[PDB]
Design a protein around this ligand. Structure first.
Ligand code: NAD
Ligand code: NAD
Ligand code: NAD
Ligand code: NAD
Ligand code: TCL
Ligand code: TCL
Ligand code: TCL
Ligand code: TCL
Ligand code: TCL
Ligand code: TCL
Lengths: 268, 268, 268, 268
């Protein structure tokens, strides 16, 4: 086919070629889809990275803490894909949390401004991002954001866990909004993946103990995952997303798909 | 081209032109997949029904309560798709619970021996069928079974619920077995679909009030469903089965996918 | 004798004679527990309200958005229950979300800065309150907070839902912290209770159709509830909080207990 | 009090003084409650064990695979507690599975008769047990059975996992039945406990590998459990049950309480 053939999808979240958003972006192109991209803080420095990709993309500035960039989103996206033209997808592949809310830093010593910043970026934005892009989105289309399963507590994810719990809650509201448009809204709970927002994360060897709470993460997840799990390889999470963007899951919304190797279904 | 070009796939459970398996076989085929089919005791019935599929495909007896068929089955399947050629997909769309287990019939009056039969056919069969079909499956291959969200109580479903709770659990284990061969196990939790048997209960064959309980229950999927649910269109669900059978969710096994238009994620 | 003979217990959140905390303080007391109480900015209001409790008990200002109260609080609590005497129980019955976050107000139009306030007060406060009160707690002691089942979408609750999703997650971590001191953390997921603010929304202060949405939603707890649910009787819920504060669930922490008459376990 | 004061509760499942049912039985007596007991296969040999207990008990034969013993249950129980006298509780502390369905024995090599036997005993019976005893049970009373969390697959629990998934499904039906009587019905998902149906289980050193998948179980669960977990000590699971029998959780049914040290809420 080109499983995303002719489809016109925006893809947020890139900042290196180890970014998952990069990998969704790649696969979506391998597969048919004229793209539009967003980046946060040097674009300059990103365009170099989005170049590294098969086909090419209008790449627009977007800082999701900016009321001013969101108000315009819809504007700019129509410039760049043409007029009388709407989007068929959207990828929220964005997140962030102060070092304070994460790693060995005690849980109680994060002050709320720090956490607020996390939630806003990792949580709220899925909803701004849908408020801005649904008006220019077609029937039978799709939004996807990237989750990491927060049902259970764990060490190191600390307050990011709490943001991800809020993400899932948001996601199902946004589905209720999106469905007035014929749009689906779903997350992809992914298994762990080698991106430098991880070697931030616990990170940075804030440890030497942290060659460890990363090796043992990769062993952990591979052991539990009935089909095994490769932390060096985003393409299984990226193919799973293109699936949601696809029409082949036309009756799932409000929902969370786990591309984690079925590790979450096993206790050990 | 799209989804299944090349893939050989068993598909259980055809009994009517309206059976969920049938709409699975159809879509499988229109997506370039060559099949073997199974069916249970009304066999030349099944051949008339399966003649209305796009491609012909062979068809084999298979009552999952009988070991001489289970034993014999990889034998017969190999035989109808050619020696040293193996199966990339398998679909159990099978299920049964004596009427004693269901509707208006009091919950406490189902004899264990009716309940043991429904659990045999609806839940244990998924394993016994995996046991037998895994020797002729192929890496990156896919088994998918049919589910109804058993995770909470409801009118009518009664002890089919309890079987579906058993299946969700069998499936995790089956994944734990199937990963040995590079094979995913997964269920698809569908919304209600107006099969024949359901056109009959809506039409009053269980009584002029039994049919109302089922109707308010039934009817509130669409009301809950962010993108609606139409129970007289099985296509979204068959489309969902193909997604699992495809290479496009390779990091999910052990799990359940909700093809219920989103409703299981909303309260009202 | 029964439940709490001997136990010293803080209990947040009294604002009305109908507040869920109040019916908690009452039952705590009738069960032989000596208390300290907190409240927020309508302070001599709180003293008239708390005069109708069986025993007197002291009362302290505590707005959880302010650090000089949080800092100061174990100071003040120690002071009102006597030096080298510590707390066996703690109750957060606190919660707020601007009206922009709720009812008929469109989901996408709540400004992050309203959402960050509701999450501050409803969810982050549970940690910041544990941080401060754990130094003066005692082994086998108990913290319990108030929840509403946020695990799926619904009309009205909107972004309070998203906060409650955050709380369920904070609570797991707080347990992970509190176990350091032989202290359980747990939430109680209540059914709806006709507090004052809710007698007002049922009575139409959000509009002659906003009040209907809430009524069909509200009303179907009792219909779902295997043992009924009466929202103008907060006693079962206060009774439930005491169970947690008691020695009689010592192997449960991190968790949520559903005091909703069973309804969250049934579909219809 | 005697938190179960004056209360009249039947307690099934004893066969040694390491049985959990033994421990619930003890604590319920420590606490006020005239008991009635059931045992399975030498009673003879059990009465010696139920003697070991504080106060004393009518101890009745009950093999839950016997249509004949259930038909009589209600009869015998009224002989033994007097007439114009009903029960206020019931403890399903019973289970069983063929060696075949458990341990290193492959999952696929259990034949269905074996599993049927498991489900019947571990699953169905909660429901026969409520069908027989609700007719002689009072308003505001309670039934409890013992769960071990089956949401995730794991090794060794094999088909017992599947029975426990069916138990939870059953439990919420039985609650729907029980509530016509004012009766609650709930499970207690317990953490692991040293009982000789465990050193059956994997068991019997069917291993030497099995000093191990038991030490590592005890280490596992203690590590994850924010308040720590002692596998040599049933009393925390037993106090949790008496709690359900109590009136202090008067608004929970259909439900599952976890007395596992909050290990299930943590991933690690
Ligand atoms: N790394 C993993 O194993 C993993 C696993 C599961 C889920 N996730 C989630 O998947 C998503 C992708 O993360 P990733 O690991 O590819 O890391 P990444 O660092 O490559 O991506 C993070 C992105 O968020 C962007 N970002 C930060 N603030 C922004 C803002 N204010 N506005 C717009 N974009 C902003 C950054 O520019 C960056 O592109 C995130 O939600 C992450 O939490 C990651
Ligand atoms: N119909 C729905 O709305 C719905 C919703 C969710 C899940 N499901 C599930 O989908 C599956 C199919 O049901 P359907 O809707 O296609 O109804 P159906 O009646 O068309 O399918 C049932 C199949 O089970 C077969 N069967 C019973 N005993 C058998 C045996 N011993 N050996 C082989 N086959 C046997 C029937 O012959 C038929 O082929 C079942 O799992 C059902 O529980 C159906
Ligand atoms: N009412 C229900 O039907 C219901 C159901 C489930 C959960 N809950 C939860 O129970 C809790 C109590 O609500 P309620 O029903 O008792 O309503 P309420 O209005 O009586 O209680 C809210 C409390 O939060 C306080 N508050 C707000 N901001 C504060 C601050 N900065 N510092 C200290 N206190 C502050 C209020 O003053 C009051 O004391 C909340 O968690 C609520 O979300 C209520
Ligand atoms: N041992 C544990 O760590 C653990 C943990 C969680 C849950 N559980 C569950 O708690 C419950 C108590 O088990 P336990 O470990 O105390 O083991 P146990 O062997 O002491 O109790 C098992 C009981 O089931 C009874 N039983 C077997 N067949 C019976 C029948 N046909 N009719 C009536 N009774 C019958 C036996 O006589 C025995 O009393 C069971 O459901 C078990 O699965 C046990
Ligand atoms: O959520 C994640 C989960 C995993 Cl296992 C790995 C990376 C993840 O993503 C992040 C974690 C922390 C920050 Cl500050 C930013 C991002 Cl994107
Ligand atoms: O699981 C199901 C759920 C729904 Cl809502 C509708 C039909 C279903 O499927 C069955 C129900 C009862 C029997 Cl006897 C056989 C089957 Cl296939
Ligand atoms: O009718 C139903 C409707 C729903 Cl939504 C769920 C279960 C139902 O019950 C049945 C489904 C199939 C068969 Cl054959 C018999 C019965 Cl009673
Ligand atoms: O969480 C709740 C759930 C329900 Cl059904 C009813 C009341 C609740 O509590 C609140 C809702 C909104 C605000 Cl602003 C403050 C509080 Cl305390
Ligand atoms: O009204 C409600 C009823 C339910 Cl069952 C759940 C949430 C509701 O919404 C509210 C609860 C409290 C406040 Cl102050 C405002 C609103 Cl809109
Ligand atoms: O369910 C259990 C879980 C654990 Cl960790 C320990 C014991 C358990 O209980 C049983 C396990 C197997 C058999 Cl054959 C009988 C029983 Cl009572």
């Amino acid at each position: 086919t080109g499983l995303l053939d002719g489809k016109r999808i925006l893809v947020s979240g890139i900042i290196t070629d180890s970014s998952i958003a990069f990998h969704i972006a790649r696969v979506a192109q391998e597969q048919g889809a004229q793209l539009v991209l967003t980046g946060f803080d040097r674009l300059r420095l990103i365009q170099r990275i989005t170049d590294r990709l098969p086909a090419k993309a209008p790449l627009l500035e977007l800082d999701v803490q900016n009321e001013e960039h969101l108000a315009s989103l819809a504007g700019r996206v129509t410039e760049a894909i043409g007029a009388g033209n709407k989007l068929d997808g959207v990828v929220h592949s964005i997140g962030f949390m102060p070092q304070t809310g994460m790693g060995i830093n005690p849980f109680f010593d994060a002050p709320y401004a720090d956490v607020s910043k996390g939630i806003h970026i990792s949580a709220y934005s899925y909803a701004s991002m849908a408020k801005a892009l649904l008006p220019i989105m077609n029937p039978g289309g799709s939004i996807v954001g990237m989750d990491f399963d927060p049902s259970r507590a764990m060490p190191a994810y600390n307050w990011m866990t709490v943001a991800k719990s809020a993400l899932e809650s948001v996601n199902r509201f946004v589905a209720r909004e999106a469905g007035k448009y014929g749009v689906r809204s779903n997350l992809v709970a992914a298994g762990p993946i080698r991106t430098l927002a991880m070697s931030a994360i616990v990170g940075g060897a804030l440890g030497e103990e942290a060659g460890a709470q990363i090796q043992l993460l990769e062993e952990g997840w591979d052991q539990r995952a009935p089909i095994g799990w490769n932390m060096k390889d985003a393409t299984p999470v990226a193919k799973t997303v293109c699936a949601l963007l696809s029409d082949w899951l036309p009756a799932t919304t409000g929902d969370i798909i786990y591309a984690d190797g079925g590790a979450h279904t096993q206790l050990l």
